[PDB]
């Protein structure tokens, strides 16, 4: 029987440790999308999220990250190539904690992702939901306080370490 993977991010604020956020990845529903995020979190392909930042945090909306090639929301790449397809839209944006793929149009998933801090149902069926925060929503809420209405962060929010549990 297969068990959904768990991954962790250790978050830092201007280089100062903040806490750990862990995620369940719904490999049972979106295996290809789950596997991308899993492998980018372990670094096992030779690239991934360790050291990258959350480039846009909008309080009461979402925290977005995963651009480890241009560091500002314009870059990123998947373990399958520069981009990969939308797998399915089985799972919906039901509330805070949902983990979902950022994109630039149909079938443009790469490495960027977002963590919901509110229900974002208008994104259903165009962003692939593939996971959820398991532990450490308090740390996501602490990260959120460094966001702003236009998404610029007031301190640098980084993934100091990440991997699989």
Ligand X SMILES: C[C@@H]1NC(=O)[C@H](C2CCC2)OC(=O)C(C)(C)/C=C/c2ccc3ccc(nc3c2)[C@@H](C)NC(=O)[C@@H]2CCCN(N2)C1=O
Which residues of the chain form contacts with ligand X (CB under 6 A)? Answer: 56, 62, 64, 73-74, 102-104, 108, 110, 112, 114, 151
Mark whether 61 is an active-site residue: yes
User: d(Cα 147, Cα 58) in Å, to the nearest integer?
Assistant: 5
Mark whether 123 is an active-site residue: yes
From the list 18, 55, 123, 146, the catalytic residue is 123
* φ, ψ for residue 144, nearest 5 deg: -55, -35
Mark whether 56 is an active-site residue: yes
Mark whether 164 is an active-site residue: no
From the list 56, 93, 112, 113, the catalytic residue is 56
Mark whether 64 is an active-site residue: yes
Name the residue nearer to ligand X (CB basis): 112 or 158. 112
Name the residue nearer to ligand X (CB basis): 152 or 156. 152
Residue 119 has what DSSP assignment? -
Q: Which tokens in the block code for residue 155?
A: 């301190």
From the list 37, 40, 54, 64, the catalytic residue is 64
**Which helix (DSSP H) or strand (DSSP E) does residue 113 occupy?**
strand 113-116
Minimum CB–partner distance for residue 112 and ligand X (Å): 4
Minimum CB–partner distance for residue 16 and ligand X (Å): 26
Kind of pairing, strands 98-101 and 157-164? unpaired
User: d(Cα 86, Cα 30) in Å, to the nearest integer?
Assistant: 10
Nearest residue to 66 (alpha-carbon basis) of 79, 81, 53, 85: 53
Other CB atoms closer than 10 Å to residue 20's CB: what's the count?
16
Name the residue nearer to ligand X (CB basis): 73 or 163. 73
Produce one character per residue of 29-41: b if its CB has 16 or more CB atoms within 10 Å, e if not.
Answer: bbebbbbbbbbbb
Mark whether 103 is an active-site residue: yes
Name the residue nearer to ligand X (CB basis): 39 or 102. 102
Residue nearest to ligand X (CB): 102
Task: Cite the active site residues.
Answer: 56, 61, 64, 103, 114, 123, 127
């Amino acid at each position: 029987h297969m068990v959904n993977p768990t991954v962790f991010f250790d978050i830092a604020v201007d280089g100062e440790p903040l806490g750990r956020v862990s995620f369940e990845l719904f490999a049972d529903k979106v295996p290809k999308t789950a596997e991308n995020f899993r492998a980018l979190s372990t670094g096992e392909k030779g690239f991934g999220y360790k050291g990258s930042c959350f480039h846009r945090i909008i309080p009461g909306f979402m925290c977005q990250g995963g651009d480890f090639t241009r560091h500002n929301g314009t870059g990123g790449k998947s373990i399958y190539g520069e981009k990969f397809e939308d797998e399915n839209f089985i799972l919906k944006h039901t509330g805070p904690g949902i983990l979902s793929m950022a994109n630039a149009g149909p079938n443009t998933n790469g490495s960027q992702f977002f963590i919901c801090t509110a229900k974002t149902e208008w994104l259903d069926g165009k962003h692939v939901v593939f996971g959820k925060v398991k532990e450490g929503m308090n740390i996501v809420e602490a990260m959120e306080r460094f966001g702003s209405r236009n998404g610029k962060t007031s301190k640098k929010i980084t993934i100091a370490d990440c991997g699989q549990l």
